[PDB]
Every structure is written in structure tokens, then in C-alpha cells.
Amino acid sequence: MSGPVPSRARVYTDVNTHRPREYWDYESHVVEWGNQDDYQLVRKLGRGKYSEVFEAINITNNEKVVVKILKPVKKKKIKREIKILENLRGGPNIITLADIVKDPVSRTPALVFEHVNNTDFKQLYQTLTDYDIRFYMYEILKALDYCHSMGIMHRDVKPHNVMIDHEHRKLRLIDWGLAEFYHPGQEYNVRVASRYFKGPELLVDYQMYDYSLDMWSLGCMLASMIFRKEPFFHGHDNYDQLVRIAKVLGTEDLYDYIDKYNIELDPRFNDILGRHSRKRWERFVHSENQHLVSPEALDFLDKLLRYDHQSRLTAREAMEHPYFYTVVKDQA
Numbered sequence: 494m495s496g497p498v499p500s501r502a503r504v505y506t507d508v509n510t511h512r513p514r515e516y517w518d519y520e521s522h523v524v525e526w527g528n529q530d531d532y533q534l535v536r537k538l539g540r541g542k543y544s545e546v547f548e549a550i551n552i553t554n555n556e557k558v559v560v561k562i563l564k565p566v567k568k569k570k571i572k573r574e575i576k577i578l579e580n581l582r583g584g585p586n587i588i589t590l591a592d593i594v595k596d597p598v599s600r601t602p603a604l605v606f607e608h609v610n611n612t613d614f615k616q617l618y619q620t621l622t623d624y625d626i627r628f629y630m631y632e633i634l635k636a637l638d639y640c641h642s643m644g645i646m647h648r649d650v651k652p653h654n655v656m657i658d659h660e661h662r663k664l665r666l667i668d669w670g671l672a673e674f675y676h677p678g679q680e681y682n683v684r685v686a687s688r689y690f691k692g693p694e695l696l697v698d699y700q701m702y703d704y705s706l707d708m709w710s711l712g713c714m715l716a717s718m719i720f721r722k723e724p725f726f727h728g729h730d731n732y733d734q735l736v737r738i739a740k741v742l743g744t745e746d747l748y749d750y751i752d753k754y755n756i757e758l759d760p761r762f763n764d765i766l767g768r769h770s771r772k773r774w775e776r777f778v779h780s781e782n783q784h785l786v787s788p789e790a791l792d793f794l795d796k797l798l799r800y801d802h803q804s805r806l807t808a809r810e811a812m813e814h815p816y817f818y819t820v821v822k823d824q825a
């Protein structure tokens with residue numbers, strides 16, 4: 494019919510605009526390799542369609558490390574993750590890229606990260622207490638506010654990509670293989686993030702999104718922690734994914750959302766979105782999650798999970814929510 498309405502990030506809108514071209518132009522980035530003979534695989538940690546991750550050891554100092562062996566994908570796709578990890582290196586709660594080597598066997602680039610004595614999230618989350626959830630969520634806001642202020646969107650926030658060393662209260666945001674630099678006006682691929690954490694802007698096919706996409710994904714994790722239902726929105730596919738959301742936030746705000754951005758809703762939604770009222774977060778409270786739920790917890794979640802990305806809270810604003818007052822404000 495007509496065209497979608499443009500959009501711009503409310504914050505960090507032109508951070509790359511004013512930075513040295515080399516900073517964001519990863520394509521012309523020239524990788525400097527290290528000595529792969531330096532590391533040895535010790536155990537498989539998991540895989541994916543773009544890589545296989547392992548636990549390794551630096552043979553020269555016995556230091557434990559994690560090696561991500563890539564799979565053919567395009568130099569551009571490779572340089573992008575490398576450029577990003579180096580621009581963020583040192584950032585709060587950002588996994589650290591220790592090295593970059595040429596894997597002889599696979600003949601593809603293998604990245605070496607700092608290793609974190611992680612505790613399976615599927616088990617860790619069942620033991621987390623109210624303070625912990627607030628605490629880790631806060632640590633994730635740091636990395637989120639840092640990468641955002643550095644002009645980068647993660648695009649794949651989820652438990653799986655958050656490493657935690659519980660005894661040491663240490664958290665790191667990993668896997669920036671889908672991370673991209675943010676340029677106002679640009680139209681991105683919506684085929685990013687993982688189903689359960691995909692934002693309505695992705696489910697509705699709106700391309701001019703921004704960092705606010707990570708806030709929704711982050712909202713999805715919060716909900717699954719305080720309610721002890723992981724994942725929270727269990728869609729069967731991308732279309733059903735939106736349906737599940739609709740069934741909680743209600744269909745009215747959803748339609749207010751596409752009307753506003755004059756989005757062309759895929760026909761396949763007509764027959765499945767239905768008509769649902771916005772449910773109250775209390776409907777998800779029970780005798781097993783009550784201790785983890787509070788007004789500040791719901792008010793916060795409420796400000797993270799909204800159709801209009803623009804209305805979502807920015808990581809920086811979120812760090813200011815009463816829900817984090819306690820979080821032993823370092824001070825020292």
C-alpha cells in the first residue's frame with residue numbers, strides 16, 4: 494500500500510557518524526594473526542551453524558581459554574565480529590578477545606576468548622534469589638550501555654550468551670557474531686537474534702530498528718527469571734512467536750504499534766493474531782516465583798517489554814530504576 498515510517502534511536506544516534514571511518518568500516522580491517530600453536534582444544538562446550546566452541550589451554554602458560562572455531566561465512570562477516578570485539582575490549586562485562594589464529598584443520602579463523610567458570614543457566618536460574626537477578630541484570634546493563642554508547646547493537650541477547658561465574662559474581666556478555674554498528678536511517682536485516690528473544694520490530698518485519706532491540710531481548714530474560722519460566726514467550730516459529738507476545742501484552746497495543754509505523758503486517762498474521770487483552774503481570778505469579786517478584790520488578794519489566802522500541806527504556810535509564818537501588822552501589 495504505502496511506505497513504513499522512519500525511526501531513529503533516542504540515544505547514541507550519531508556516535509559512529511562522528512567517529513573515524515576505520516572504527517566502523519570493518520571490511521577494510523586487516524586482521525593480525527597470532528600463533529595457533531599456542532593453544533590446544535581440551536573439550537567441546539557447544540556449537541552452532543556459524544561456529545563450534547571449545548574449552549582450551551594456552552600451552553605456554555597453562556592459562557585456560559575458550560576457542561571459537563568459525564565456519565566458512567565471508568571475510569566481511571568475520572571482520573565484523575573482530576572489529577567489534579576490539580572496539581569493546583576492556584568494556585564492562587564484555588568478554589575479552591585474547592587472540593585470533595588460523596585453525597589449520599578447519600582452515601577458518603579461530604578466535605580465543607578469556608575463559609569464565611560458567612554455571613549452566615538452566616540450573617543456575619533455579620537457584621538464583623531476588624538480589625541475584627537484580628544484580629546480574631544490572632551487570633548486563635553495563636555491557637549493554639557500553640556497547641550501545643560505542644555505537645554497537647548486540648542483536649542476540651539471551652541466557653546462552655551470558656556467562657556467569659556465580660561464586661565470584663562475575664558476568665560476561667559473549668557471542669557478538671550478530672552484532673552490528675548502528676547508523677541512523679539504515680535498514681537492517683531482521684533475521685537476527687533468536688526466536689524467543691526476537692522483538693516485535695523483527696517479527697513484524699520493521700527494518701529501521703536500533704539498540705532498543707536489545708532491551709526487549711533483555712526484557713525477555715528478566716521475565717523468565719522472576720517468573721521461573723524459561724523461555725517466557727515460547728513461540729513455535731516467528732509468527733507464533735508474536736502471537737505468544739500478543740497473548741500477554743494484548744492485541745490492541747500491537748495494532749497501535751503497526752498503525753504508528755505504518756508497517757505492512759504479513760497476511761499470515763490475520764488468521765493467528767486473534768484478539769487478546771493485555772494481561773496483568775500478576776497472572777504469572779505463583780507460589781514458586783513470588784519471592785522473586787516485586788512492584789519495582791514488574792514496573793521495570795513493564796518498561797522493557799513494549800511493542801514500540803522507541804518507548805522502551807535505554808540501558809542507561811534502566812540502570813536508574815528503583816529496582817537496582819540496593820545493588821550494593823560499589824562506591825568502593
Ligand SMILES: O=C(O)Cc1ccn(-c2cncc(-n3ncc4ccc(NC5CCCC5)cc43)n2)c1
Binds near residue numbers: 538539561607
Ligand atoms: O563469544 C562466543 O560466541 C564464544 C565464547 C566466548 C566466550 N565463551 C566462554 C567463556 N567461558 C566459558 C564458556 N563456557 N563455559 C561453559 C559453556 C557451555 C556452553 C557455552 N556455549 C557457547 C556460547 C554459545 C554456544 C557456544 C559456553 C561455555 N564460554 C564462549
